[PDB]
Amino acid sequence: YQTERFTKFSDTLKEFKIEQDPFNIIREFRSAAGQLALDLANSGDESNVISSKDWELEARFWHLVELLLVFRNADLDLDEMELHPYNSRGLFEKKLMQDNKQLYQIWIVMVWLKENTYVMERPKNVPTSKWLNSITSGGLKSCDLDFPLRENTNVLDVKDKEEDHIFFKYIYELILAGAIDEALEEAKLSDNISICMILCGIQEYLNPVIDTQIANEFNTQQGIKKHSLWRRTVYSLSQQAGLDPYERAIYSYLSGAIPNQEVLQYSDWESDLHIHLNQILQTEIENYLLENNQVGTDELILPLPSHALTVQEVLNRVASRHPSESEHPIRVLMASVILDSLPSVIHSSVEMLLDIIDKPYLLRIVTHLAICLDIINPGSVEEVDKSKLITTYISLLKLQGLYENIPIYATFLNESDCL
Amino acid sequence: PYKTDNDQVKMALLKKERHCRLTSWIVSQIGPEIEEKIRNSSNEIEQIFLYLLLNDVVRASKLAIESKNGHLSVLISYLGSNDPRIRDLAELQLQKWSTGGCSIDKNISKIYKLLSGSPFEGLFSLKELESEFSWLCLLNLTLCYGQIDEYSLESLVQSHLDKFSLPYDDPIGVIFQLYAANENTE
């Protein structure tokens, strides 16, 4: 049956044009692609696993699109935040994220990135308690994380290191997926309390009594006051070798840094891009705080880079670092959406009809995207480009013998006359 | 001097200000005592602790960093934020050690106890330091870490005094007692 597909997308348009909010269209597009992603995946020829991934990718694209256009377009401007110098860093961070939309967009994108991150299954047969093997062998004179740093790593039993590897890798995957809470649960329950405490340092300080404007979200102070310190402390910890590469990787991510080579070598376009947006973000916040004298000089223990990249440039670098992935045509759209250069690329792939034809999803996707765009933002895509796009997709509805659902697509030109 | 959105915030800021001045002053007093002690220590982690005794979180953190105690270093940076998560986590770690825990360094435990927010009030207690430090120094410990936000300055100081008899004849002691006694100063 699967050669139903076009119907599904077409179907959504019917429903929209017939209940005369348009963001639902896209939401449905997402679900549609996702549903299809499941079909080709379950039981299939290994020729299907490829086009299955091109559907999952499809789906993620619709999601990213929803998220960003919702934020950008459903922009109805709220009330400005009036801080005082007595206010906590927590509030300044919040203000920053309110006022600066360019940067919040980065947040949105990172959220999306996390959303779609793979995490291994929870490690089984995890041991009763930490470093149990070394303790049992004798020779651990102190039971604290810093003991084998104080003197040769030869102290720790092999099996203990191996388990620490399992743990830190799992925690890292959880952190990249945004699963910070699950990471704290794992830390707690796997007898890694100190690592947990480290993970608690992620929050900026807020106090409900002083920072009135969040006396709703909180009843008790939380987060840590000397954060610039925390951050250098973590970064330094991250650079200290004789630690597992995933642990160092974790601290790298937390400090707004770029994890060690041993770990970074396995990160893909999405993962890598995520890492570097994280860096942009971290740097931008800390600079925002410095520009408002909310950092205390004592805390500037160490040099961290102060110069934030632009999303343009991060994308550019990650691109040259992951060419295969980068060049994939829906991931190009992903970037195009991220930078807002989206009608730009529509008109572009339009002229590529004048190796877009070789890949099937593309001509569809661009067309439906163009439709959505002009629905949500009338004027968005040039009248001509709509004409050209629908023209060509329609002639494929003909080649598939689904003339049945052509009128729906007609509802966008007087050129429709000619059908 | 600066204007405040509402008046309970003002009250809160005034509390912070007073607290900061009191604790800067205590550090002024205990200063040479502790600096002497740091002079004579032969152990780095103990020095880190003493730096916490002078309410210098940053130099402690720095020495930690330098002495290859990095995790500790991270933990230290929390001292003086009253994050109840960290408080209960630190206490938990302390119980786990104090139930088996074949061996934990004597000063690392002290530092964790400081993170616990109740360094004498406790089950890994710094109360025995009664015999090694000026009463004022330990009071500094309660006042700086101790649980600043949930308590008023008075009932906090009172909390500390409830754990330690001060010498009858000592007048700066007397003033703390009169301050904490609040409801019945007279």
Coordinates of C-alpha atoms in Angstrom, one line a residue:
Chain A
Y1 CA 0.0 0.0 0.0
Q2 CA 2.7 2.5 1.2
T3 CA 2.5 4.3 -2.2
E4 CA -0.4 6.0 -0.4
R5 CA 2.0 8.6 1.1
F6 CA 1.0 11.7 -1.0
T7 CA -2.6 11.2 0.2
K8 CA -1.5 11.7 3.8
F9 CA 0.1 15.1 3.1
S10 CA -2.7 16.0 0.7
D11 CA -5.1 14.9 3.3
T12 CA -3.9 17.4 5.8
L13 CA -4.3 20.2 3.3
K14 CA -7.9 19.2 2.7
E15 CA -8.7 19.5 6.4
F16 CA -7.1 22.9 6.6
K17 CA -8.8 24.4 3.5
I18 CA -12.1 22.9 4.7
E19 CA -12.5 24.2 8.3
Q20 CA -12.7 27.9 7.2
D21 CA -3.5 27.3 13.8
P22 CA -2.0 26.7 10.4
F23 CA 1.0 25.4 12.4
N24 CA -1.0 22.2 12.8
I25 CA -0.4 21.5 9.1
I26 CA 3.3 21.2 9.8
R27 CA 2.7 19.3 13.0
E28 CA 0.8 16.8 11.0
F29 CA 3.4 16.7 8.3
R30 CA 5.8 15.8 11.1
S31 CA 3.6 13.0 12.4
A32 CA 3.0 11.8 8.9
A33 CA 6.7 11.5 8.1
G34 CA 7.2 9.9 11.4
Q35 CA 4.5 7.3 10.8
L36 CA 6.1 6.5 7.5
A37 CA 9.5 6.3 9.1
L38 CA 8.1 3.5 11.2
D39 CA 6.7 1.6 8.2
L40 CA 9.8 1.3 6.1
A41 CA 11.8 0.5 9.2
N42 CA 10.0 -2.4 10.9
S43 CA 10.1 -5.3 8.5
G44 CA 11.8 -4.3 5.3
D45 CA 14.3 -4.9 2.5
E46 CA 17.7 -3.4 3.5
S47 CA 17.0 -1.0 0.6
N48 CA 14.3 0.4 2.8
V49 CA 16.5 1.2 5.8
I50 CA 18.0 4.1 3.7
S51 CA 14.7 5.7 2.7
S52 CA 13.6 5.0 6.3
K53 CA 16.3 7.3 7.6
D54 CA 15.4 9.9 5.0
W55 CA 11.9 9.8 6.5
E56 CA 13.0 10.1 10.1
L57 CA 15.1 13.0 8.9
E58 CA 12.1 14.4 7.1
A59 CA 10.2 14.3 10.4
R60 CA 12.9 16.0 12.4
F61 CA 12.9 18.7 9.7
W62 CA 9.1 19.4 10.2
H63 CA 9.7 19.5 13.9
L64 CA 12.5 22.0 13.8
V65 CA 10.3 24.0 11.4
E66 CA 7.4 24.0 13.8
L67 CA 9.5 25.0 16.8
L68 CA 11.2 27.9 15.1
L69 CA 8.3 29.4 13.1
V70 CA 6.0 29.1 16.1
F71 CA 8.5 31.1 18.2
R72 CA 9.3 33.7 15.4
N73 CA 5.8 34.2 14.1
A74 CA 3.5 33.7 17.2
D75 CA 5.6 36.6 18.5
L76 CA 3.1 38.9 20.3
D77 CA 5.3 41.0 22.4
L78 CA 5.0 40.6 26.2
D79 CA 6.2 42.8 29.1
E80 CA 9.9 43.8 29.6
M81 CA 11.7 42.7 32.7
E82 CA 13.1 45.4 35.0
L83 CA 16.0 44.1 37.0
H84 CA 18.1 45.7 39.7
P85 CA 21.8 45.2 40.6
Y86 CA 20.8 43.4 43.8
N87 CA 19.1 40.8 41.6
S88 CA 20.6 37.3 41.2
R89 CA 22.5 36.1 38.2
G90 CA 19.6 33.7 37.6
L91 CA 17.3 36.6 36.8
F92 CA 19.9 38.2 34.5
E93 CA 20.2 34.9 32.6
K94 CA 16.4 34.8 32.3
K95 CA 16.2 38.5 31.1
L96 CA 18.9 37.7 28.5
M97 CA 16.8 34.8 27.1
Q98 CA 13.7 36.9 27.0
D99 CA 15.1 40.0 25.4
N100 CA 17.5 38.5 22.9
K101 CA 15.5 36.5 20.4
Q102 CA 18.5 35.6 18.2
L103 CA 19.9 33.7 21.1
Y104 CA 16.8 32.1 22.4
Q105 CA 16.5 30.7 18.8
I106 CA 19.8 29.0 19.6
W107 CA 18.2 27.6 22.7
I108 CA 15.2 26.3 20.6
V109 CA 17.5 24.6 18.2
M110 CA 19.6 23.0 20.9
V111 CA 16.4 21.7 22.5
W112 CA 15.4 20.2 19.2
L113 CA 18.9 18.7 18.9
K114 CA 18.6 17.1 22.3
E115 CA 15.1 15.8 21.5
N116 CA 16.6 13.7 18.7
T117 CA 19.7 12.4 20.4
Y118 CA 20.4 8.7 20.9
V119 CA 21.0 7.3 24.3
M120 CA 22.2 3.8 25.1
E121 CA 20.0 1.5 27.2
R122 CA 20.6 1.8 31.0
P123 CA 23.6 -0.3 32.0
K124 CA 22.6 -3.5 33.6
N125 CA 24.2 -5.5 36.4
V126 CA 25.5 -2.2 37.8
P127 CA 27.4 -2.8 41.1
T128 CA 26.0 -2.3 44.6
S129 CA 28.5 0.4 45.3
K130 CA 31.4 2.6 43.9
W131 CA 35.0 1.4 43.5
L132 CA 34.1 -1.8 45.4
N133 CA 36.9 -3.8 43.7
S134 CA 39.6 -1.4 44.8
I135 CA 38.3 -1.3 48.4
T136 CA 38.2 -5.1 48.5
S137 CA 41.7 -5.4 47.1
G138 CA 42.9 -3.0 49.8
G139 CA 44.9 0.1 49.0
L140 CA 42.3 2.8 48.8
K141 CA 43.4 4.9 51.7
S142 CA 40.7 7.5 50.8
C143 CA 37.4 6.9 49.1
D144 CA 37.1 10.2 47.4
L145 CA 37.1 10.9 43.6
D146 CA 40.3 13.0 44.0
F147 CA 42.4 10.2 45.6
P148 CA 43.8 8.6 42.5
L149 CA 44.6 12.1 41.2
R150 CA 46.6 13.0 44.3
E151 CA 48.8 9.9 43.5
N152 CA 49.2 7.5 40.6
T153 CA 46.1 6.0 38.9
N154 CA 47.6 2.6 39.6
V155 CA 45.5 2.8 42.8
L156 CA 42.2 1.9 41.1
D157 CA 41.4 -1.7 40.2
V158 CA 40.9 -2.3 36.5
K159 CA 37.2 -3.5 36.8
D160 CA 36.4 -0.3 38.7
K161 CA 37.8 1.8 35.9
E162 CA 35.8 -0.2 33.4
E163 CA 32.6 0.4 35.3
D164 CA 33.4 4.0 35.8
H165 CA 33.6 4.0 32.0
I166 CA 30.2 2.5 31.6
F167 CA 28.7 5.0 34.0
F168 CA 30.4 8.2 32.6
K169 CA 29.6 7.2 29.1
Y170 CA 25.9 6.7 30.0
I171 CA 25.7 10.0 31.9
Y172 CA 27.3 11.8 29.0
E173 CA 24.8 10.4 26.5
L174 CA 22.0 11.4 28.9
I175 CA 23.4 14.9 29.2
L176 CA 23.6 15.4 25.4
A177 CA 20.0 14.4 25.2
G178 CA 18.9 17.0 27.8
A179 CA 18.2 14.1 30.2
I180 CA 19.9 16.0 33.0
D181 CA 17.4 14.8 35.6
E182 CA 17.9 11.1 34.5
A183 CA 21.6 11.7 34.9
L184 CA 21.1 13.0 38.4
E185 CA 18.9 9.9 39.2
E186 CA 21.7 7.7 37.8
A187 CA 24.3 9.5 39.8
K188 CA 22.3 9.2 43.0
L189 CA 21.3 5.5 42.5
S190 CA 24.6 4.2 41.3
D191 CA 26.5 5.5 44.3
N192 CA 28.0 8.5 42.5
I193 CA 26.9 11.2 44.9
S194 CA 29.8 13.5 44.3
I195 CA 29.3 13.5 40.5
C196 CA 25.7 14.2 41.2
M197 CA 26.7 17.3 43.3
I198 CA 28.8 18.4 40.3
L199 CA 25.8 18.1 38.1
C200 CA 23.8 20.2 40.5
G201 CA 26.1 23.2 39.8
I202 CA 24.4 23.6 36.4
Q203 CA 21.9 26.1 37.8
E204 CA 22.5 29.8 38.2
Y205 CA 21.5 31.2 41.6
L206 CA 17.9 32.4 42.2
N207 CA 16.3 33.5 45.5
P208 CA 12.4 33.8 45.5
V209 CA 12.5 36.6 48.2
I210 CA 14.8 38.9 46.3
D211 CA 14.2 37.8 42.7
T212 CA 10.4 38.5 43.2
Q213 CA 9.6 38.0 39.5
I214 CA 10.1 34.3 39.8
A215 CA 8.6 33.9 43.3
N216 CA 6.1 31.7 41.4
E217 CA 8.5 29.0 40.1
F218 CA 10.4 28.7 43.3
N219 CA 9.7 28.7 47.1
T220 CA 13.3 28.2 48.2
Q221 CA 16.6 29.6 47.0
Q222 CA 18.5 27.4 44.6
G223 CA 21.5 27.4 42.3
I224 CA 25.0 28.4 43.1
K225 CA 26.2 32.0 43.6
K226 CA 29.8 31.8 42.6
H227 CA 29.1 30.3 39.1
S228 CA 32.0 31.8 37.1
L229 CA 34.1 30.0 39.7
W230 CA 32.2 26.8 39.4
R231 CA 32.6 27.0 35.6
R232 CA 36.4 27.5 35.6
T233 CA 36.6 24.8 38.3
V234 CA 34.7 22.3 36.1
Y235 CA 36.7 23.3 33.0
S236 CA 40.0 22.8 34.8
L237 CA 38.7 19.5 36.1
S238 CA 37.9 18.7 32.5
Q239 CA 41.4 19.3 31.3
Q240 CA 42.9 17.1 34.0
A241 CA 44.0 13.8 32.5
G242 CA 43.9 10.5 34.3
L243 CA 40.2 11.0 34.2
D244 CA 38.0 8.9 31.9
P245 CA 37.5 10.6 28.5
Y246 CA 33.7 10.7 28.9
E247 CA 34.0 12.3 32.4
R248 CA 36.2 15.0 30.9
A249 CA 33.7 15.2 28.0
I250 CA 30.9 15.8 30.5
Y251 CA 32.8 18.6 32.2
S252 CA 33.7 20.1 28.9
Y253 CA 30.0 20.3 27.9
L254 CA 29.2 21.8 31.3
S255 CA 31.8 24.5 31.0
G256 CA 30.7 25.5 27.6
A257 CA 33.7 23.9 26.1
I258 CA 34.5 21.4 23.3
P259 CA 35.1 17.8 24.6
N260 CA 38.3 15.9 24.1
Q261 CA 39.3 14.3 20.8
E262 CA 38.7 10.7 22.0
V263 CA 35.0 11.5 22.6
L264 CA 34.5 14.2 19.9
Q265 CA 35.7 11.9 17.1
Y266 CA 32.4 10.0 17.4
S267 CA 30.0 12.9 17.3
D268 CA 27.9 13.4 14.2
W269 CA 26.6 16.6 12.5
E270 CA 23.8 16.9 15.0
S271 CA 26.0 16.0 18.1
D272 CA 28.9 18.3 17.0
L273 CA 26.6 21.2 16.1
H274 CA 24.9 20.8 19.5
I275 CA 28.3 20.9 21.3
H276 CA 29.2 24.2 19.5
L277 CA 25.9 25.9 20.0
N278 CA 26.3 25.0 23.6
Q279 CA 29.6 26.8 23.5
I280 CA 28.1 29.9 21.8
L281 CA 25.4 29.9 24.4
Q282 CA 27.6 29.5 27.5
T283 CA 29.9 32.2 26.3
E284 CA 27.1 34.7 25.5
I285 CA 25.5 34.3 28.9
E286 CA 28.8 34.8 30.8
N287 CA 29.5 37.9 28.6
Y288 CA 26.0 39.2 29.3
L289 CA 26.8 38.8 33.0
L290 CA 30.1 40.6 32.8
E291 CA 28.5 43.5 30.9
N292 CA 26.2 43.9 33.9
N293 CA 28.8 43.6 36.7
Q294 CA 27.2 40.4 38.1
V295 CA 30.5 38.5 38.0
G296 CA 33.0 39.0 40.9
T297 CA 36.7 39.4 40.1
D298 CA 37.7 36.7 42.5
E299 CA 35.9 34.1 40.4
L300 CA 37.9 34.7 37.2
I301 CA 40.4 31.9 38.2
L302 CA 41.2 31.0 34.6
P303 CA 40.9 32.0 30.9
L304 CA 38.0 30.7 29.0
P305 CA 37.4 32.0 25.4
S306 CA 35.2 35.1 25.4
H307 CA 34.5 35.3 21.7
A308 CA 31.2 33.8 20.7
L309 CA 30.8 32.3 17.2
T310 CA 27.8 33.2 15.0
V311 CA 25.4 30.4 14.1
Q312 CA 26.3 31.1 10.5
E313 CA 29.9 30.3 11.3
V314 CA 29.3 27.3 13.6
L315 CA 27.2 25.8 10.9
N316 CA 29.9 26.5 8.4
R317 CA 32.6 24.8 10.5
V318 CA 30.5 21.8 11.5
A319 CA 29.6 21.6 7.8
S320 CA 33.2 21.3 6.7
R321 CA 33.7 18.8 9.5
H322 CA 30.8 16.5 8.4
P323 CA 30.5 17.0 4.6
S324 CA 28.6 13.8 3.9
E325 CA 26.0 14.6 6.5
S326 CA 26.0 18.4 5.7
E327 CA 25.3 18.0 2.0
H328 CA 22.3 15.7 2.6
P329 CA 19.5 17.7 1.0
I330 CA 17.0 17.8 4.0
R331 CA 19.9 18.8 6.4
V332 CA 20.6 21.6 4.0
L333 CA 17.0 22.7 4.6
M334 CA 17.6 22.2 8.3
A335 CA 20.4 24.7 8.2
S336 CA 18.4 27.0 5.9
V337 CA 15.6 27.1 8.5
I338 CA 18.1 27.7 11.3
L339 CA 19.5 30.7 9.5
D340 CA 16.1 31.9 8.2
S341 CA 17.5 31.9 4.6
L342 CA 14.6 29.6 3.7
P343 CA 12.7 31.2 0.8
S344 CA 16.3 31.8 -0.4
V345 CA 16.8 28.1 -0.7
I346 CA 13.2 27.5 -2.0
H347 CA 13.8 29.8 -5.0
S348 CA 17.2 28.0 -5.3
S349 CA 16.1 24.4 -5.6
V350 CA 13.4 25.8 -7.9
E351 CA 16.1 27.0 -10.2
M352 CA 17.7 23.5 -9.9
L353 CA 14.7 22.6 -12.0
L354 CA 15.6 24.7 -15.1
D355 CA 20.1 16.2 -9.3
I356 CA 17.0 17.5 -7.4
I357 CA 14.9 15.2 -9.5
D358 CA 17.1 12.2 -8.6
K359 CA 15.9 12.2 -4.9
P360 CA 12.1 11.8 -4.5
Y361 CA 11.4 13.4 -1.0
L362 CA 12.9 16.7 -2.1
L363 CA 10.5 18.1 -4.7
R364 CA 7.6 17.1 -2.4
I365 CA 9.1 18.6 0.7
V366 CA 10.0 21.9 -0.9
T367 CA 6.5 22.2 -2.4
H368 CA 4.6 21.6 0.9
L369 CA 7.0 23.8 2.8
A370 CA 6.4 26.6 0.3
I371 CA 2.7 26.1 0.8
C372 CA 3.0 26.2 4.6
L373 CA 5.2 29.3 4.4
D374 CA 2.8 31.3 2.3
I375 CA -0.1 30.2 4.5
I376 CA 1.7 31.3 7.7
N377 CA 3.4 34.3 6.2
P378 CA 1.5 35.5 3.1
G379 CA 4.1 36.8 0.6
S380 CA 6.9 34.5 1.9
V381 CA 7.7 32.6 -1.3
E382 CA 7.5 34.2 -4.7
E383 CA 4.2 33.6 -6.5
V384 CA 6.1 32.2 -9.5
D385 CA 8.1 29.7 -7.3
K386 CA 4.8 28.4 -6.0
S387 CA 3.5 28.1 -9.5
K388 CA 6.6 26.2 -10.7
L389 CA 6.7 23.9 -7.7
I390 CA 3.1 22.9 -7.7
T391 CA 3.1 22.5 -11.5
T392 CA 5.9 20.0 -11.2
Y393 CA 4.6 18.1 -8.2
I394 CA 1.2 17.9 -9.8
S395 CA 2.7 16.3 -12.9
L396 CA 4.0 13.6 -10.6
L397 CA 0.6 13.2 -9.0
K398 CA -0.3 12.4 -12.6
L399 CA 2.6 10.0 -13.0
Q400 CA 1.5 8.2 -9.9
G401 CA -2.1 8.1 -11.1
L402 CA -3.5 10.0 -8.2
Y403 CA -5.4 12.6 -10.1
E404 CA -8.1 12.3 -7.4
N405 CA -6.4 14.7 -5.0
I406 CA -5.1 17.4 -7.5
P407 CA -7.8 20.1 -6.9
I408 CA -6.6 20.7 -3.3
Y409 CA -3.1 21.8 -4.6
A410 CA -4.8 24.0 -7.2
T411 CA -6.2 26.3 -4.5
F412 CA -3.2 28.7 -4.9
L413 CA -3.3 30.2 -8.4
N414 CA -5.5 31.4 -11.1
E415 CA -3.2 29.3 -13.2
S416 CA -5.4 26.5 -11.8
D417 CA -7.8 27.5 -14.6
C418 CA -5.5 25.5 -16.9
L419 CA -6.4 22.2 -15.3
Chain B
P1 CA 20.3 53.4 49.7
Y2 CA 18.9 52.0 46.5
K3 CA 15.1 51.8 45.8
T4 CA 13.4 48.4 46.1
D5 CA 10.4 47.1 44.1
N6 CA 8.7 46.1 47.4
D7 CA 9.6 46.3 51.1
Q8 CA 10.2 42.6 51.9
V9 CA 12.9 42.5 49.3
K10 CA 14.4 45.5 51.1
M11 CA 14.2 43.6 54.4
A12 CA 16.0 40.7 52.7
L13 CA 18.8 42.8 51.3
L14 CA 19.3 44.5 54.6
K15 CA 19.7 41.1 56.1
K16 CA 22.3 40.1 53.5
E17 CA 24.3 43.4 54.0
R18 CA 24.4 43.0 57.8
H19 CA 25.4 39.3 57.4
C20 CA 28.2 40.2 55.1
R21 CA 29.6 42.8 57.4
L22 CA 29.4 40.6 60.4
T23 CA 31.2 37.8 58.6
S24 CA 33.9 40.1 57.2
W25 CA 34.5 41.3 60.7
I26 CA 34.8 37.9 62.2
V27 CA 37.3 37.1 59.5
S28 CA 39.2 40.2 60.5
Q29 CA 39.4 38.8 64.0
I30 CA 40.3 35.2 63.4
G31 CA 42.6 36.2 60.6
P32 CA 46.0 35.9 62.2
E33 CA 45.0 32.7 64.2
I34 CA 44.2 30.9 61.1
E35 CA 47.0 32.3 59.0
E36 CA 49.3 31.0 61.8
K37 CA 47.7 27.6 61.5
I38 CA 48.1 27.6 57.7
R39 CA 51.8 28.5 58.3
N40 CA 52.3 25.3 60.3
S41 CA 50.1 22.8 58.4
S42 CA 52.0 20.0 56.5
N43 CA 49.0 18.8 54.5
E44 CA 47.3 20.6 51.5
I45 CA 43.7 19.5 52.1
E46 CA 43.9 20.8 55.7
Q47 CA 45.1 24.2 54.3
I48 CA 42.1 24.2 52.0
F49 CA 39.9 23.7 55.0
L50 CA 41.7 26.5 56.9
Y51 CA 41.1 28.8 53.9
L52 CA 37.5 28.0 54.3
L53 CA 37.9 29.0 57.9
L54 CA 38.8 32.4 56.6
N55 CA 35.8 32.4 54.4
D56 CA 38.0 32.5 51.3
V57 CA 36.2 30.1 49.1
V58 CA 38.3 31.1 46.0
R59 CA 41.7 30.5 47.5
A60 CA 40.5 27.1 48.8
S61 CA 39.2 26.3 45.3
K62 CA 42.6 27.4 43.9
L63 CA 44.7 25.3 46.3
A64 CA 42.4 22.3 45.6
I65 CA 42.9 22.9 41.9
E66 CA 46.7 23.1 42.4
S67 CA 46.9 20.1 44.8
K68 CA 45.2 17.9 42.2
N69 CA 42.0 17.7 44.3
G70 CA 39.8 18.8 41.4
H71 CA 36.4 17.3 42.3
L72 CA 36.8 18.8 45.8
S73 CA 37.6 22.1 44.1
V74 CA 34.3 21.9 42.2
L75 CA 32.4 21.1 45.4
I76 CA 34.0 24.1 47.3
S77 CA 32.6 26.6 44.8
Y78 CA 29.1 25.9 46.3
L79 CA 30.1 27.2 49.7
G80 CA 28.0 30.2 50.5
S81 CA 25.2 29.4 48.1
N82 CA 22.7 27.7 50.4
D83 CA 21.6 25.1 47.7
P84 CA 19.5 22.6 49.7
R85 CA 20.1 19.9 47.1
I86 CA 23.9 20.1 47.7
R87 CA 23.2 20.2 51.4
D88 CA 21.3 17.0 51.5
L89 CA 23.6 15.3 49.0
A90 CA 26.7 16.2 51.1
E91 CA 25.0 14.8 54.2
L92 CA 24.0 11.7 52.3
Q93 CA 27.6 11.1 51.2
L94 CA 28.7 11.6 54.8
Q95 CA 26.2 8.9 56.0
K96 CA 27.3 6.5 53.3
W97 CA 30.9 6.9 54.4
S98 CA 29.8 6.7 58.1
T99 CA 28.3 3.3 57.4
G100 CA 31.1 1.1 56.1
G101 CA 33.2 3.6 54.2
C102 CA 36.6 1.9 55.0
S103 CA 38.5 5.2 55.1
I104 CA 37.9 8.8 54.1
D105 CA 40.5 11.6 54.5
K106 CA 40.0 13.5 57.8
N107 CA 39.7 17.0 56.2
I108 CA 37.7 16.0 53.1
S109 CA 35.1 14.9 55.5
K110 CA 35.3 18.2 57.4
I111 CA 34.7 20.1 54.1
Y112 CA 31.8 17.9 53.2
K113 CA 30.4 18.6 56.7
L114 CA 30.7 22.3 55.8
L115 CA 28.7 21.7 52.6
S116 CA 26.1 19.9 54.8
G117 CA 25.2 23.2 56.3
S118 CA 25.3 21.9 59.8
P119 CA 28.9 21.4 60.8
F120 CA 28.4 20.8 64.5
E121 CA 24.6 20.2 64.5
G122 CA 25.6 16.8 63.1
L123 CA 26.7 13.2 62.7
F124 CA 30.3 13.8 61.6
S125 CA 30.6 16.7 63.8
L126 CA 33.2 19.5 63.9
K127 CA 32.2 20.1 67.5
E128 CA 35.6 18.5 68.6
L129 CA 37.3 21.5 66.8
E130 CA 36.0 23.3 69.9
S131 CA 39.4 22.5 71.4
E132 CA 41.5 23.7 68.4
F133 CA 39.8 27.0 67.4
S134 CA 38.6 30.3 68.8
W135 CA 34.9 30.0 69.6
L136 CA 34.5 32.9 67.2
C137 CA 36.1 31.0 64.4
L138 CA 33.6 28.1 64.7
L139 CA 30.8 30.6 65.0
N140 CA 32.1 32.0 61.7
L141 CA 31.6 28.5 60.3
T142 CA 28.0 28.4 61.4
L143 CA 27.4 32.0 60.1
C144 CA 29.0 31.6 56.6
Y145 CA 27.7 28.1 55.7
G146 CA 25.4 27.0 58.3
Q147 CA 22.0 27.7 56.6
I148 CA 21.8 31.5 56.0
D149 CA 18.6 31.8 54.1
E150 CA 16.1 29.7 56.1
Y151 CA 17.1 31.4 59.4
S152 CA 17.3 35.0 60.6
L153 CA 20.7 36.3 61.7
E154 CA 19.6 36.1 65.3
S155 CA 18.2 32.6 65.4
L156 CA 21.2 31.4 63.4
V157 CA 23.7 32.9 65.9
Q158 CA 21.4 31.5 68.6
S159 CA 21.6 28.1 66.9
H160 CA 25.4 28.2 67.2
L161 CA 25.4 29.4 70.8
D162 CA 23.1 26.6 71.8
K163 CA 25.9 24.2 70.8
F164 CA 28.7 25.9 72.7
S165 CA 29.1 27.6 76.0
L166 CA 31.1 30.8 75.7
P167 CA 33.4 32.0 78.5
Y168 CA 31.4 34.0 81.0
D169 CA 34.0 36.8 81.1
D170 CA 34.3 37.4 77.3
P171 CA 32.4 40.5 76.2
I172 CA 32.3 40.0 72.4
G173 CA 30.7 36.8 73.5
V174 CA 28.2 38.6 75.6
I175 CA 27.2 40.9 72.7
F176 CA 26.5 37.9 70.5
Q177 CA 24.4 36.4 73.2
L178 CA 22.4 39.6 73.7
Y179 CA 22.0 39.9 69.9
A180 CA 20.7 36.3 69.5
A181 CA 18.5 36.5 72.6
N182 CA 16.1 38.8 70.7
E183 CA 12.8 37.8 72.3
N184 CA 14.2 38.3 75.8
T185 CA 17.3 40.5 75.6
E186 CA 16.5 42.1 78.8

